[PDB]
Each structure stands twice: as C-alpha cells, then as structure tokens.
Design an enzyme around this catalytic site. Structure first.
Site, PDB file in Angstrom:
ATOM      1  N   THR A 253       0.702  -1.115  -0.110  1.00 36.67           N
ATOM      2  CA  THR A 253      -0.004  -0.112  -0.070  1.00 36.67           C
ATOM      3  C   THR A 253       0.970   1.311  -0.044  1.00 36.67           C
ATOM      4  O   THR A 253       0.370   2.429   0.206  1.00 36.67           O
ATOM      5  CB  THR A 253      -0.819   0.030   1.257  1.00 36.67           C
ATOM      6  OG1 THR A 253      -0.216  -0.027   2.462  1.00 36.67           O
ATOM      7  CG2 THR A 253      -1.948  -1.057   1.087  1.00 36.67           C
TER       8      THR A 253
ATOM      9  N   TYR B  87       3.113   5.133   6.199  1.00 39.28           N
ATOM     10  CA  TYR B  87       2.466   5.562   4.635  1.00 39.28           C
ATOM     11  C   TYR B  87       1.282   6.438   4.811  1.00 39.28           C
ATOM     12  O   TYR B  87       0.230   6.213   5.341  1.00 39.28           O
ATOM     13  CB  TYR B  87       2.228   4.073   4.060  1.00 39.28           C
ATOM     14  CG  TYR B  87       3.229   3.031   3.712  1.00 39.28           C
ATOM     15  CD1 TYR B  87       4.635   3.542   3.558  1.00 39.28           C
ATOM     16  CD2 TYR B  87       2.816   1.814   3.522  1.00 39.28           C
ATOM     17  CE1 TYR B  87       5.279   2.762   3.368  1.00 39.28           C
ATOM     18  CE2 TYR B  87       3.785   0.698   3.305  1.00 39.28           C
ATOM     19  CZ  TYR B  87       5.299   1.197   2.892  1.00 39.28           C
ATOM     20  OH  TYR B  87       6.324   0.415   3.095  1.00 39.28           O
TER      21      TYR B  87
ATOM     22  N   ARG C 280      15.383  -3.973   5.879  1.00 40.13           N
ATOM     23  CA  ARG C 280      16.612  -3.169   5.702  1.00 40.13           C
ATOM     24  C   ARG C 280      17.636  -3.194   6.701  1.00 40.13           C
ATOM     25  O   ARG C 280      18.342  -2.397   6.929  1.00 40.13           O
ATOM     26  CB  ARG C 280      16.129  -1.798   5.429  1.00 40.13           C
ATOM     27  CG  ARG C 280      15.110  -1.104   4.537  1.00 40.13           C
ATOM     28  CD  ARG C 280      14.535   0.486   4.916  1.00 40.13           C
ATOM     29  NE  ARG C 280      13.758   0.683   4.224  1.00 40.13           N
ATOM     30  CZ  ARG C 280      13.253   1.674   4.140  1.00 40.13           C
ATOM     31  NH1 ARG C 280      13.548   2.663   4.868  1.00 40.13           N
ATOM     32  NH2 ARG C 280      11.975   2.214   3.202  1.00 40.13           N
TER      33      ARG C 280
ATOM     34  N   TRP D 218      10.308  -6.333  -1.998  1.00 37.04           N
ATOM     35  CA  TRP D 218       9.534  -5.104  -2.189  1.00 37.04           C
ATOM     36  C   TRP D 218      10.250  -4.184  -3.492  1.00 37.04           C
ATOM     37  O   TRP D 218      11.280  -4.635  -4.008  1.00 37.04           O
ATOM     38  CB  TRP D 218       9.419  -4.163  -1.052  1.00 37.04           C
ATOM     39  CG  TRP D 218      10.834  -3.979  -0.293  1.00 37.04           C
ATOM     40  CD1 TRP D 218      11.142  -4.417   0.899  1.00 37.04           C
ATOM     41  CD2 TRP D 218      11.441  -2.492  -0.524  1.00 37.04           C
ATOM     42  NE1 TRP D 218      12.079  -3.619   1.241  1.00 37.04           N
ATOM     43  CE2 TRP D 218      12.337  -2.550   0.255  1.00 37.04           C
ATOM     44  CE3 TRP D 218      11.359  -1.480  -1.650  1.00 37.04           C
ATOM     45  CZ2 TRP D 218      13.229  -1.529   0.607  1.00 37.04           C
ATOM     46  CZ3 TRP D 218      12.602  -0.732  -1.229  1.00 37.04           C
ATOM     47  CH2 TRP D 218      13.400  -0.677  -0.236  1.00 37.04           C
TER      48      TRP D 218
ATOM     49  N   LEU E 156       9.544  -3.820  -9.392  1.00 40.77           N
ATOM     50  CA  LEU E 156       9.621  -3.041 -10.732  1.00 40.77           C
ATOM     51  C   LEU E 156      10.169  -1.908 -10.628  1.00 40.77           C
ATOM     52  O   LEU E 156      10.226  -0.914 -11.319  1.00 40.77           O
ATOM     53  CB  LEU E 156       8.337  -2.941 -11.382  1.00 40.77           C
ATOM     54  CG  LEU E 156       7.272  -4.308 -11.464  1.00 40.77           C
ATOM     55  CD1 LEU E 156       6.037  -3.640 -12.088  1.00 40.77           C
ATOM     56  CD2 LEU E 156       7.817  -4.934 -12.604  1.00 40.77           C
TER      57      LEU E 156
ATOM     58  N   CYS F  96       9.682   0.381  -8.629  1.00 41.11           N
ATOM     59  CA  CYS F  96       8.699   1.768  -8.522  1.00 41.11           C
ATOM     60  C   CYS F  96       8.204   1.828 -10.088  1.00 41.11           C
ATOM     61  O   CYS F  96       7.481   2.875 -10.115  1.00 41.11           O
ATOM     62  CB  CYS F  96       9.208   2.992  -8.160  1.00 41.11           C
ATOM     63  SG  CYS F  96      10.105   3.168  -6.589  1.00 41.11           S
TER      64      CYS F  96
ATOM     65  N   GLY G 135       2.975  -3.536  -6.196  1.00 45.40           N
ATOM     66  CA  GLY G 135       2.427  -2.169  -6.260  1.00 45.40           C
ATOM     67  C   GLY G 135       1.497  -1.998  -7.216  1.00 45.40           C
ATOM     68  O   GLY G 135       1.855  -2.540  -8.587  1.00 45.40           O
TER      69      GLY G 135
ATOM     70  N   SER H 184      -1.394   0.911  -9.115  1.00 45.49           N
ATOM     71  CA  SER H 184      -2.045   2.044  -9.125  1.00 45.49           C
ATOM     72  C   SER H 184      -3.500   1.946  -9.637  1.00 45.49           C
ATOM     73  O   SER H 184      -4.241   2.592  -9.629  1.00 45.49           O
ATOM     74  CB  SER H 184      -1.361   3.325  -9.780  1.00 45.49           C
ATOM     75  OG  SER H 184      -1.007   3.094 -11.050  1.00 45.49           O
TER      76      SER H 184
ATOM     77  N   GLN I  72      -3.011  -2.893 -14.003  1.00 47.39           N
ATOM     78  CA  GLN I  72      -1.675  -3.273 -13.650  1.00 47.39           C
ATOM     79  C   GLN I  72      -1.747  -4.848 -12.725  1.00 47.39           C
ATOM     80  O   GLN I  72      -0.881  -5.680 -13.198  1.00 47.39           O
ATOM     81  CB  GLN I  72      -0.949  -2.262 -12.883  1.00 47.39           C
ATOM     82  CG  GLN I  72      -0.783  -1.106 -13.739  1.00 47.39           C
ATOM     83  CD  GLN I  72      -0.540   0.297 -12.746  1.00 47.39           C
ATOM     84  OE1 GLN I  72      -0.577   0.098 -11.561  1.00 47.39           O
ATOM     85  NE2 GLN I  72       0.054   1.375 -13.389  1.00 47.39           N
TER      86      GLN I  72
HETATM   87  N1  NAP Z   1      11.324  -0.588   3.372  1.00 42.97           N
HETATM   88  C1  NAP Z   1      10.022  -1.341   3.105  1.00 42.97           C
HETATM   89  O1  NAP Z   1       9.917  -2.260   3.750  1.00 42.97           O
HETATM   90  C2  NAP Z   1       9.528  -1.181   1.772  1.00 42.97           C
HETATM   91  C3  NAP Z   1       9.718   0.094   0.977  1.00 42.97           C
HETATM   92  C4  NAP Z   1       9.089   0.058  -0.126  1.00 42.97           C
HETATM   93  C5  NAP Z   1       7.906  -0.614  -0.434  1.00 42.97           C
HETATM   94  N2  NAP Z   1       7.630  -1.629   0.517  1.00 42.97           N
HETATM   95  C6  NAP Z   1       6.503  -2.631  -0.019  1.00 42.97           C
HETATM   96  O2  NAP Z   1       6.474  -3.023  -1.606  1.00 42.97           O
HETATM   97  C7  NAP Z   1       5.377  -2.215  -1.994  1.00 42.97           C
HETATM   98  C8  NAP Z   1       5.706  -1.490  -3.378  1.00 42.97           C
HETATM   99  O3  NAP Z   1       6.292  -1.810  -4.264  1.00 42.97           O
HETATM  100  P1  NAP Z   1       6.798  -0.752  -5.316  1.00 42.97           P
HETATM  101  O4  NAP Z   1       5.348  -0.104  -5.478  1.00 42.97           O
HETATM  102  O5  NAP Z   1       7.584   0.277  -4.503  1.00 42.97           O
HETATM  103  O6  NAP Z   1       7.300  -1.093  -6.913  1.00 42.97           O
HETATM  104  P2  NAP Z   1       6.179  -1.831  -7.738  1.00 42.97           P
HETATM  105  O7  NAP Z   1       7.516  -2.474  -8.430  1.00 42.97           O
HETATM  106  O8  NAP Z   1       5.733  -2.886  -6.553  1.00 42.97           O
HETATM  107  O9  NAP Z   1       5.510  -0.492  -8.254  1.00 42.97           O
HETATM  108  C9  NAP Z   1       4.567  -0.518  -8.683  1.00 42.97           C
HETATM  109  C10 NAP Z   1       4.046   0.880  -9.043  1.00 42.97           C
HETATM  110  O10 NAP Z   1       4.685   1.169 -10.478  1.00 42.97           O
HETATM  111  C11 NAP Z   1       3.789   1.198 -11.634  1.00 42.97           C
HETATM  112  N3  NAP Z   1       3.287  -0.506 -12.247  1.00 42.97           N
HETATM  113  C12 NAP Z   1       3.144  -1.719 -11.619  1.00 42.97           C
HETATM  114  N4  NAP Z   1       2.694  -2.595 -12.407  1.00 42.97           N
HETATM  115  C13 NAP Z   1       2.624  -1.981 -13.773  1.00 42.97           C
HETATM  116  C14 NAP Z   1       2.267  -2.285 -15.091  1.00 42.97           C
HETATM  117  N5  NAP Z   1       2.118  -3.533 -15.071  1.00 42.97           N
HETATM  118  N6  NAP Z   1       2.475  -1.577 -16.086  1.00 42.97           N
HETATM  119  C15 NAP Z   1       2.735  -0.347 -15.881  1.00 42.97           C
HETATM  120  N7  NAP Z   1       2.907   0.388 -14.521  1.00 42.97           N
HETATM  121  C16 NAP Z   1       2.944  -0.446 -13.584  1.00 42.97           C
HETATM  122  C17 NAP Z   1       2.410   1.501 -10.899  1.00 42.97           C
HETATM  123  O11 NAP Z   1       1.727   2.786 -11.490  1.00 42.97           O
HETATM  124  P3  NAP Z   1       2.371   3.933 -11.481  1.00 42.97           P
HETATM  125  O12 NAP Z   1       3.892   3.844 -12.130  1.00 42.97           O
HETATM  126  O13 NAP Z   1       1.533   4.918 -12.325  1.00 42.97           O
HETATM  127  O14 NAP Z   1       2.388   4.654 -10.034  1.00 42.97           O
HETATM  128  C18 NAP Z   1       2.594   1.115  -9.426  1.00 42.97           C
HETATM  129  O15 NAP Z   1       2.218   2.299  -8.711  1.00 42.97           O
HETATM  130  C19 NAP Z   1       4.643  -1.437  -1.013  1.00 42.97           C
HETATM  131  O16 NAP Z   1       3.123  -1.835  -1.069  1.00 42.97           O
HETATM  132  C20 NAP Z   1       5.130  -1.518   0.288  1.00 42.97           C
HETATM  133  O17 NAP Z   1       4.387  -2.146   1.141  1.00 42.97           O
HETATM  134  C21 NAP Z   1       8.236  -1.823   1.431  1.00 42.97           C
END
Ligand code: NAP
Ligand code: NAP
Ligand code: NAP
EC number: 1.1.1.-
Lengths: 326, 122, 326, 326
Positions: free
Chosen positions: D21, D55, D154, D208, D211, D213, D288, D290, D294
C-alpha cells in the site's frame, strides 16, 4: 518483640498474630459477631486474615468478603490468605492440578469479592499431581495477578524443598510459607523440620490452632462446657480427644502450666499463644475466636513474649515432657 | 562477596570479587583493565584464550600466591598467559625459578674503550 | 550539545532537562501555575516529567495527570516517570515488596489517569525485601504494560549491580537508570561510583536537585527570602542548612562562582545546571521551579554547556574544593 | 510453481505474491480503487497485504482496514503485515525502543481496526536501541496477542543474526522474515547475503519494489508519462533517477530484456516479477499497483515462473551485467 514480622524471608510484612475463619465464620458465630471480631483485630494492628474454600463450603469466604467490603478498609493494608484443595464433590474439584488451582482460586476470589489474595496456599499435599504442574499453576495465578505469593500447608520439608527445587529448575516462583499446626502438644514439624528450611530457602511458618482448638485454653478442666467447640454438632472427634486417656493427661499438665502462667502474670491462653511465637522461624500465629472476649484476651499474648526466658521455657518443657528430638 | 564469572573459550569459572581484588595490579583485579572483556548480556567476562592454563591462573588468586604450571600445559604457552593476565614480574620470576630456569650475568669492560676492547679477544 | 539523550544505554530518548513535581505540584504552587510550567516545558522540547506517590500524598500525580488530560498532548511524545516506596501508613503500604510495587503503581497510574508510566522507580532501597522479589515485581508490572522500564533511586552501586545480576540469573529485566542527587555540593556518587555502572551495564543517571533546593541559586546570599522554599512551613530542615556553619561556607563559595558565571556570560542557576550535564554518565537533570520565571531562566543552561571547558571546570573545582577522590 | 509458500521456515503460508500500500492507499489512488484492487487480489488467492504506520501518515492503514471491515472477509484467511519505525515528529515517536514499538503497533492496530497483525516488522535498523530491547519488545507484543510473528526490514545479515542470537540467549522469539528491496537492478543483499540466513536460521525474504517503482515496467522508455509515479508531486527523486545517466542505461537494457520477454511469451512486468520469485530464499514478492489493469497483468507473472530455465537466467544476467559476486 516486633509486632510486624516478614513472612519467611519475603518482603510481605504480617502481624505476628492473625485471625482465621475455620469453624466460626458462616458457621458457629453470626455475621455480626464475625464483623465485630475482624474490626477489633484490624483496629488492633492485626493485618492477617486466613480462610479456605473448604470452610463452611465457601461460606466463610463470603462473610469475610462482606466485611472487607462493608468496612471499606484499603486493600493495601490487608493481607488476605486462602487455601485451596477441597472444592467440590466432583473428581476434578479437589487436588493441586492446574485445573483445580485456577478454578478454585477464581471461585474463592469471586466469593471474597476481591481481585486477588495476598497468599494462596495448597491446603495439603497432592500425591496425584506432579510437583511441576502445581508449581507452574501457582506461578500462573500469581502472574495473572490473582495472588501475590503462594505457600504450602501440611507438606513435609521434603515436599516443600521439592517445590522450591522445581521452581528453580524451570524458573518458576518458589513458595514462601508453610501453614503448619503448632501448639504445646504438637511440636515436631515446626521445631525440628522447618528451621532448616527457614534458614536455607527462606520459608517461614504461619502456624495454626495455637490452643489446639481450645484444649490448651483450660476451659476443659472439668468437662465439655455448653457452646464450646468440643460440644458443637460435627466436632465429636474433638470431644473424644478431650475425654480420651491422653485427653486427661493433657488437662493435668495444663494445671501445672497454670502456675507458670501466674508467675508470668498472664492467662493460660496468652502463654500458650506467646509460646508459639518464641522461635524466629514462626512468622505469624493464626488465632481462632468464637467471640470478642477471647480475641481481646489472646492479643495480650504479645506482652508475655518478652518474659519467655531460657529458664521458663526449659521449665515448660519439663512439664510437657514432649520436647522433640534434634 | 559479589560473584564474578569468567568464561574462557566456553569453560566457565566463578570466584568472588574479593578473591581477584587481592591483586589490584593484575588484569582481572583491575576494574578498568577487565572492563574491556565484560559481556553485559551474560554477566560474565569472556576471553578467547587457552583453557588448560586458567585453572592455574585462578588458583593463584585463591591460594594467595601459588602459581604452578599445569602438568599438561607447555611452558611456552603458560608463560604467555601469565604475561597476558599481567600477574607481574615478581610472580613470573618466582614461577620461572620453581620451573627450573634462573640466572643471568656478564657486563663488558666498564667504559675502558680499549680495556673492554681487549677483554673481547681473551 | 545534543538536546536529547538516551537514558543510560536504553532506546528511550529524554530531553537533557526534565521537570519534576516535588514540593510544588499540589503543594507550594497553584494548579494553574503547574499547568503554565508544564506547558512552557513541553513547548520548549522538554519531554520528561517526574513525580512520586509520596509527593503531597499523591496530590502531585493528580495535578500532573489533569494537565496531560487537559492539554490533550499525545502520550507517545511524553516520558512520565513515577517513584514507588512510601504509599501509606499501613505496614504493608511501604517498601519494595511485590504487593506494594503492584498496588503502589496501580494507585499512581489511577491518580495520573494513565494506562502506564514510561519508567517506574523504586524510590529507595529496601533492606527488608529480597532483591529477587523486587526485580520480579518490576518485571511483572512491565510485562503487564503498566510501565515501559524501571529504575532505582538512592541505591548504592552494589545494590544496582545486584538488581542487574539477579535479573540476568532469572531472565528478568534489568533496571536502566538510577535517580541520584547531584549538585555542586553533592558529587561523590555520581562522579565516582556511577560511571563504572554506566559503561559496564548501561545504567544512566537522572540527577535531582541541581540547585540543592535553591541553595545553589544564590537567592540566599543575605537571608531567608519571603516565599522561598527554605521559608515554607515544613521545610525547617532546609532553613537550618542554609543558616548552618556549613551553610555560610557554601554561600561564600557561591559568590566566588558568581564570577565564573559572568565570565561565561550566564546566570548562576544556568551554570549550576549546565555543570551537572557536563559528564556523559548523566542522561538528564530534573529541574524544580516554583514559577515560570525560574523555568525560563534555567532552560538557558543548555547554551552554557558548550562553554564548560577543562580549564573552567578545573577552576570551579578549585573554588568548591570538594572534588571527589578517584 | 507452488502458489503458496512458507514465509521462511515458519508455519505461516503466504501467497508468492502480495499487494502493498505504499504511495497508493490514502494517497495516489482513491478509496474505491483501493477496494477494487484488494478485492481483485483476494479473489485471486493473494492473502498477503503490507502496510506501514509511515504510509500517508497512517492513512493507508485506515483505508486497508476499512476495506477488510467492509468486505467482511474472515480474519483467518488474511495475512496482514505492518511496519514500525517512523510514527511522529516527537523524539520518542520513532525508533525501535520498547516504548515506540508498543505505542506504534497499538496505534496501527487501532487505525487498522484489527486486534492483531500477522507479522509486525521493524521498518529499519535502529543504531540507538540495544538489540535486546527490540527483541524483547517484539516478543512482548506477540505474547500480548498484538502480532503473531515479527520481522526485520533493511537490516544487514549481521543485524538479523544478532536479533536471532539475542533471542536464543534470553529465550525470546526470533524474527522469521526480512523485507528487502529486490529487483533486476538491486540484487546484492537478497542473492548474496540472505541465502545463508535462510538455510541457517530459517529467515525468509519478502521482497519489495519488484519493478523498481515502475522503472522496470518499461513505461519510461520515452519520458515521464502523465499520472505515472515518477510524475507525482513528492517523487522528484524518482524522476531524477529515470532521467539520470544511469537511468538511460537501465532503459536501454530494458529494451534488450524486452526480447527475452517475447521469447517467453509474456510482458516485461510479468518477467520482472517472475524473476524475483526464481530463487527459493524468496518467500513472497510485494506488488505495487495504481490500478486494476496493472494488478491483473502482474499476477500473470506466475505462469512465467516455470519457464525461467538456467539458460534464460544466464542470458538475463548477460544483459544486466550486474550479477553479484559470491
Ligand atoms: N522499506 C520497506 O519495507 C518497503 C519499501 C518500499 C515498498 N515496500 C512494499 O512494497 C510495495 C511497493 O512496491 P513498489 O510499489 O515500490 O514497486 P512495484 O515495483 O511494487 O511498483 C508498482 C508501481 O509501479 C507501476 N506499475 C506496476 N505495475 C505496472 C504495469 N504492469 N504496467 C505499468 N506500470 C506498472 C504502478 O503505476 P504507477 O507508475 O502509475 O504509479 C505502481 O504504482 C509497497 O506496497 C510496500 O508495502 C516496502
Ligand atoms: N490446615 C490448615 O491450614 C489449617 C487447619 C486448621 C486451622 N487453620 C487456621 O487456624 C485457625 C484456627 O485456629 P483454631 O481455631 O483451630 O485453634 P485456636 O487455638 O485458634 O482455637 C480457638 C477456638 O478455641 C476457643 N478459644 C480461643 N481463645 C479462647 C480463650 N481465650 N478462652 C476460652 N476459649 C478460647 C474459642 O471458643 P470455642 O471453644 O467456644 O469454639 C475458639 O473458637 C483458623 O482460622 C484457620 O484459618 C488452618
Ligand atoms: N529521591 C528522589 O528521587 C528525588 C528527591 C528529590 C527530588 N527529586 C526530583 O527532582 C526535582 C526537584 O529538584 P529540586 O526542586 O529539589 O532542586 P532544584 O534544584 O530542582 O530546586 C528548585 C526550587 O528552587 C528554586 N529555584 C529554581 N530555580 C531558580 C532560579 N532560577 N532562581 C531562583 N530560585 C530558583 C525554586 O523556587 P523556590 O526556592 O521559591 O521554592 C524551586 O522551587 C523534583 O521534581 C523531583 O521529581 C527526586
């Protein structure tokens, strides 16, 4: 000398004299008298009150609880103790199993209208439950805040040492006290076996029946008085002991002690009670009283304690002729 | 009589603080010196060293002076430990005496320049 | 330099200055002033507030609690600490027994209107309770979520090390702090005995009475001012010390320090307070203040801390001539 | 192959893909979309949902909680995880101290409207809190039934091993998982350092940002699309990386991988995600998304996993040329 003593080597401070509720509360005496007795005791510095799930089938706990609630005394100025073992007719309602210790204490606390007791005692040893199960359960109710400490009653020193030993092995809480019977005609355990435990593992003794249910009071010199405990319905066993061969023998020795009493300037009950308090291993002595007269007289045993010199004690041993072998 | 626990590569040793305090100038007897080896999680001092030697080091404190080398421990190793636990030179000397060794002398011709020069050929 | 410090080696971060409630809250000052003081402190980054069951017989806890409740500050941004020992006139209402520690803290938390305190302290050592009973009880109230950590107060380093040692033996929780008195005329314990404990077992010090109740402020150069603490009914002992022979001696040395103060460009109280904070073993210093003027001035001690160089400190030692032996 | 995996060597079974999230919930997307996403995920067998107190300043937890409550899904069929570290502006509202871990989790559980989370993670290492304090606090919230298990995020393998080691020493509960960042351009930790820990102490990895981000999706081949994450207010850092020198380099390699994708018959995101799941040390990958498009596409990464042969992987390493040293 000191009116307040530590129970064994724990931080809990009890008055050297406490008031119990066996036979009397919810039984022999009325609720108003029970209230009168506790008020008198409390107003005299006594902070220790003992009861048991088995006393008058839970009735004594209720009366004791109603008084505490009615008088509004602060819970932190009281030391309530209750014993667990016989809690019902069912097979699972007696013993020191985890089930009965938790169920028993919960039901007592309910009748007492208290969130916790200061010390919960195993009323007697349980040959059918592993020591570990009992020590763990005592520890569990203490960590649950249902009791502050726990103790044994009628356990041998072997058994008490076992409970302590199991406690150290599993990092559980060791018992701090053993409620043993102690009076001029019952001295073995307290004088021979418990002292080592008091110095070795801090277990102190809280003795009961200091007047042997009244026998040592001297009220039975002639026969069985009206309204005495030995006369009450249900205490035939007691009447038998008093009229027994051994009974007559004790009454004869009581007449000899009657002289030691006058020499010390006190009554026989005060001497009998003060006697029980002469040794340091005895933390407190639980008193019995069917009325306010007895309690007032018995509390006087404290002024006699300073007079119990080596000589007097050796003389009292001569008369009794039952001093236990070391 | 606060107790003290000393862990030598896993071999556990215990003694009283006054026993070590008996010799204030040694490593174990100096709070500032042993501080470095204390493990606050286990309430013990830990030394990643030779095990057979320690019974002797400790006994030295308990006996109040006796420093004997364990029959089964090489002399080169045990002397290295004696030095590490900083038992001091007075003790090492007496230790070395009882162990056998002992001696030392000489001294070249005092100044002389030439005296001490010839006294090196004859 | 750093405004926030770790209390000893724990993860709890406290402001190097805290505000206490002895004498003032529910006592010398009014509830509105107390509120004014805490608001000022809180708005200045101070997150540490100290109280005790014994302060104004539980009155200070109530006032402190009413303020926290009235101002609606988030509980997670506050560090409330309270001390336990003297909780009543009954024999069982004082000490470090399991009964009093649990009953005492429960009653304080009640007066404070809080679910828990961050640190509960044993107000002083208890010669009558085994260390194990005390360490276990501190651990129990922490596991019950009534406190986050526990500490000692007025304990010797021998005693603090004992509590730590017993904690490791039984797998209990060790204390993290010792609340010791510390000021220019009371330096032995903090400077000679606690440093080893801070480096050895992470115990930090939270010092109290940095101005020796006002003595070190300089307000007593002449005599006993009106409305000062030394004048208040009940603090005759304090007045005696100030007029004592030793009292005059201290006041004379204060005039000498008055020069060191001007050299550093600060007031005497700011120097006295900043002085207590010069050594790392001191986690925080608990301030006392009967009004907003004092608090505002005293908080200024923080800008003086950087100026306390080796030279100045050695000069201050010369004037005091009471530097403790290593 | 197996859709459900054990998290490390614990008994908790998680879907190899989870939905997080960060950025989206209570932020980039609407509450209705968030609900749509979770429903889709849940209906597809995904049982893992990750959030954090940090978050959207606690906003994501609330949205996640409202959905779970609205949909009425059984709590036992869900695996909710939340991270703790940054919980406020106060000094005492961040870190892994006992105070913040308990206060932080209590506040998250409150926002989530849940009695407990399945796994609570320390969001990052805390140089200022002793490992013992953190391990004890994690253990305390688990024994309080506020969490079922705990993990790190981390942390270095040195730190994770330390937490495990301290747990064994004090008989506390060891962490079972480490939430590490893992994707084609971030491989060191997961591929070189965590495998030993997985085989040695059962710690599994929940990775995590598969992709990076969005970078690894291929949506940035040209420039910064409208409504993409790199464009959103607050994510300037992300935009910089993409336009960076290194950014262009990655985008070039993505075009090379684009061929490997078509050879395998899938989209680039499905390959990037399936790639992260090729090694057994990885228990689950947090996705992740949006929007619903996706998520639907990404879940397809599971059919690609069987195709990731030695050859393809060695070819992908050639293109990336960033395979970590053993
Ligand atoms: N320190 C930690 O523990 C930590 C840190 C970060 C994250 N996390 C966890 O990991 C999760 C996040 O992973 P993430 O969001 O950072 O990387 P993802 O690689 O999980 O990122 C996905 C984001 O990139 C874009 N995306 C995803 N799939 C797509 C597709 N098929 N085609 C086009 N665009 C796509 C999306 O749209 P947009 O580009 O339009 O936004 C989406 O918002 C979080 O929910 C969190 O709980 C943990
Ligand atoms: N297993 C155990 O743990 C256990 C067992 C038994 C008792 N206890 C404890 O010890 C207490 C009982 O002690 P106890 O009652 O059995 O022996 P006591 O020696 O405590 O017995 C006192 C009874 O004897 C009579 N008495 C007392 N003082 C007297 C006096 N000054 N003058 C004339 N008569 C007097 C009373 O009147 P009456 O003769 O008219 O009745 C009273 O009912 C109980 O409260 C109980 O809590 C524990
Ligand atoms: N055993 C323990 O653990 C223990 C014991 C004592 C205290 N404490 C803690 O430490 C705190 C008390 O410290 P303390 O009050 O005793 O010594 P301080 O040195 O903390 O005493 C401050 C008192 O002295 C006077 N004062 C302070 N600043 C002044 C200034 N700038 N100018 C003039 N006068 C000033 C004040 O006015 P007045 O002179 O008009 O009153 C004030 O009431 C308490 O809050 C308590 O929590 C702990």
């Amino acid at each position: 000398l000191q009116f307040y003593r530590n129970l064994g080597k724990s931080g809990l401070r009890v008055s050297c004299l406490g008031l119990g509720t066996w036979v009397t509360f919810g039984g022999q005496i009325t609720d108003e008298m029970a209230e009168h007795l506790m008020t008198l005791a409390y107003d005299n510095g006594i902070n220790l009150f003992d009861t048991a799930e088995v006393y008058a089938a839970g009735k004594a706990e209720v009366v004791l609880g109603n008084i505490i609630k009615k008088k509004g005394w602060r819970r932190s100025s009281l030391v309530i103790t209750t014993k667990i073992f016989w809690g019902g007719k069912a097979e699972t309602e007696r013993g020191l199993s985890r089930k009965h210790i938790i169920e028993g204490l919960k039901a007592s606390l309910e009748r007492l209208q208290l969130e916790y007791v200061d010390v919960v005692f195993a009323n007697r040893p349980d040959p059918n439950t592993p020591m570990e199960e009992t020590v763990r359960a005592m520890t569990h109710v203490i960590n649950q805040g249902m009791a502050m400490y726990w103790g044994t009653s009628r356990w041998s020193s072997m058994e008490i040492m076992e409970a302590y030993s199991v406690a150290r092995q599993f990092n559980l809480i060791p018992p701090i006290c053993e409620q043993a019977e102690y009076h001029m005609f019952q001295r073995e355990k307290v004088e021979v076996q418990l002292p080592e435990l008091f110095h070795k593992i801090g277990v102190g003794a809280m003795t009961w029946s200091p007047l042997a249910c009244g026998i040592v009071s001297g009220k039975y010199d002639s026969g069985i008085p009206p309204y005495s405990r030995a006369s009450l319905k249900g205490y035939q066993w007691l009447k038998d002991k008093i009229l027994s061969e051994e009974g007559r023998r004790q009454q004869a020795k009581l007449k000899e002690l009657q002289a030691i009493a006058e020499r010390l300037g006190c009554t026989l009950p005060q001497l009998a009670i003060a006697w029980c308090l002469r040794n340091e291993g005895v933390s407190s002595v639980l008193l019995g009283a069917s009325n306010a007269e007895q309690l007032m007289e018995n509390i006087g045993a404290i002024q006699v304690l300073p007079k119990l010199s080596s000589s007097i004690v050796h003389e009292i041993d001569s008369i009794l002729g039952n001093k236990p072998y070391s | 009589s606060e107790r003290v626990v000393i862990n030598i590569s896993g071999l556990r040793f215990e003694t009283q603080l006054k026993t070590l305090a008996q010799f204030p100038e040694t490593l174990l007897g100096d709070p500032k010196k042993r501080m470095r080896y204390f493990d606050p999680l286990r309430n013990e001092y830990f030394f990643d060293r030779n095990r057979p030697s320690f019974d002797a080091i400790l006994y030295y404190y308990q006996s109040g002076g006796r420093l004997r080398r364990p029959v089964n421990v090489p002399l080169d190793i045990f002397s290295e430990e004696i030095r590490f636990y900083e038992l001091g030179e007075e003790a090492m000397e007496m230790f070395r005496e009882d162990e056998g060794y002992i001696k030392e002398e000489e001294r070249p011709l005092p100044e002389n320049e030439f005296q001490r020069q010839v006294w090196l050929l004859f």
